[model samples]
Target: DVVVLQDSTFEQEVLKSDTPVLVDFWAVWCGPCKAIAPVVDDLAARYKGKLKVAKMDVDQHQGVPQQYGIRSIPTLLVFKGGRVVDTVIGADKTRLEDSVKKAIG
Candidate 1:
C-alpha cells in the first residue's frame, strides 16, 4: 500500500523509516503525475515488504518539497538511511523500479 505523506509527518514516516522509501512528489493538476499513477501503485505491490512507497501532494505540502528542491511534478526520490540515494524526474517506470531495487539492496 502507498502512504500519503505530509510535511509534518515527513521526518518520522520517511526520513526515519527503517526501510527504503520511494516518494512520489506530485499534484492533482499534473498530467504526467496521473499518467504514472498506476506504475507507482504497481511498484508498491511488487516490492511490498522490501520497499516503502509513498506519495506527497505538492499542493498540500510545501516545506519538504521545497527543501528537497522538487521543482518538477512526478519527481521520484528513493531514500535510504534518511538520505536520497536515487532520483527520477518524470514518469519513468523502468527507472523507478530500478531505483527501488538498488535502494533496497
Candidate 2:
C-alpha cells in the first residue's frame, strides 16, 4: 500500500500530490526505522486513497531530506498542498496517527 520514493520523483509524487502524503524517512541501519515499518504499512492500507504513504531511504535519497532538515531517522512528515503541514519525529505511532487524522480530516 506504500510507494517508494526517491529524490527524482519526490517533487511530483509527494509535493504536488493531491492527497496528503505521509513520508517515512528511514535507513537500513536504523533500528527504529525497522520497528516503525509495520505501523507505516498499516496506515497506508487503512487510509488508502485518502493518504499516500511513501518511504524514502535516507541512504539513497539525500536531496529532499536535506531540504527538510531531517536530522534523524524515522521522521514522519505529512505533506499537503506542496508544503510540510505536520511532522512526527521518531517511532511514535500515536503522534503519527494524530497528524494523519488531522491532515486527512
Candidate 3:
C-alpha cells in the first residue's frame, strides 16, 4: 500500500523518514500518470519496508511540488535523510525502478 500525500503531511511522512521515500508527483486526468500508477503501486508492495512509497496529487496539493521544482505531471522525487537523492520524470517503469533501488541502497 502507498501513502496518499498532501502538503501538510509531506514533511512528517517523507522528509523525516529514516528510510528512503519515493514521492510520485502526479495529477488526476493525466493519461501518463494513470499509465504508471500500477507500477508505482507494485513498487510500494515489492519494496515494502525497504522503501516507503507515496503519491501526491499535484492538482490538489501544489505547494510541495512547487517547492521541489516539479514541472511535469509524472515527476518522481526520491528522498533520503530529509533531502532529495534522485529524481525521475515520465512513465518509464525500468528507469523508475532502478532509481528507487539506487536511492534505497
Candidate 4:
C-alpha cells in the first residue's frame, strides 16, 4: 500500500521509523516522477518486511522537501533512526535499490 505522507506526519512516520524508510520526493507535474512510481511500488512490495516505502508530493508537502533541501524531482532519500543515510536523485531503479540495500543492510 502507498502511504501518502504530508508535512504533519513526515517526521513521525518517516524520520522516526525503526526500520529503514525510503522517501520519494515527487510532484504531480513531473514526468520522471510518474515514470518511476511503479518501480518505487515494486521495490516497496519486494522489500516490505525490511523497509518502509513512502511517497510525498513536493507540491503538497512543502515542509519535508525544504527540511531535506530537495532541489530536484524524483529524489529518493533513505532514512534510518531519524536521519538521512543515503540519497538517490533521478529515475534510476538500480541505483536506488543499491542505495537501499547499502543503507538497510
Error of 4 at 11 (Å): 1.0
lDDT of candidate 3 over 27-88, digit per residue (tens): 88889999889999999999997999999999999898999999987888888899888788
Model 1, 1-105: lDDT tens digits are 999999999999899999999999999999999988899999899899888899999999999999999999899999998999988999998998888889987
Q: Which stretches of candidate 1 lie over 4 Å from their true place?
A: none
Alpha-carbon runs more than 4 Å astray in model 4: none
Give candidate 3 regions above 4 Å deviation: none
Model 1 C-alpha lDDT versus the unseen true structure: 0.93
Error of 4 at 72 (Å): 0.9
Checking candidate 1 for backbone clashes, the offending pairs are none
- The 10-residue segment of model 4 with minimum total lDDT is 79-88
In order of appearance, the predictions have TM-scores of 0.97, 0.97, 0.95, 0.95
In candidate 1, residue 71 scores what lDDT? 93
lDDT of all predictions, in order shown?
0.93, 0.94, 0.91, 0.89
* Tens digit of per-residue lDDT, candidate 2, span 44-68: 9999979999999998999989999
